[PDB]
């Protein structure tokens, strides 16, 4: 019902879509494709994480769910950024 929550939810879904594509292509050794999807995923993760979600009005199961989505997104953003830098610098094992 709050518009800030749907932004978080949309970012969560899109980020997963692109990071999953990135991981699929990465596992298949398609490193240029992977970097592409990872960068798109980063954009969505950043947006979802950027939404203020600890204010006074931010109460209830919806906001709680949104915060947990952002928790997940911050963790994944760290992992994607690491893998991206590794691929960009050609250090993939």
């Amino acid at each position: 019902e709050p518009a800030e929550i749907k932004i978080i939810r949309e970012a969560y879904k899109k980020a997963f879509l692109f990071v999953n594509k990135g991981l699929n292509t990465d596992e298949l050794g398609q490193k240029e494709e992977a970097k592409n999807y990872y960068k798109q995923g980063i954009g969505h993760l950043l947006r979802g994480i950027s939404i203020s979600s600890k204010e006074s009005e931010h109460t209830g199961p919806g906001w709680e769910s949104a915060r947990q989505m952002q928790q997940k997104m911050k963790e994944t953003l760290q992992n994607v950024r690491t893998r991206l830098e590794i691929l960009e610098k050609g250090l993939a094992t």
Binding site: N20, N79, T82
Partner: peptide
Amino acid sequence: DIDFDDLSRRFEELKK
């Protein structure tokens, strides 16, 4: 059935 935890697992595996 979106599971971000599964993503983390796959990144860890790519390091091996």
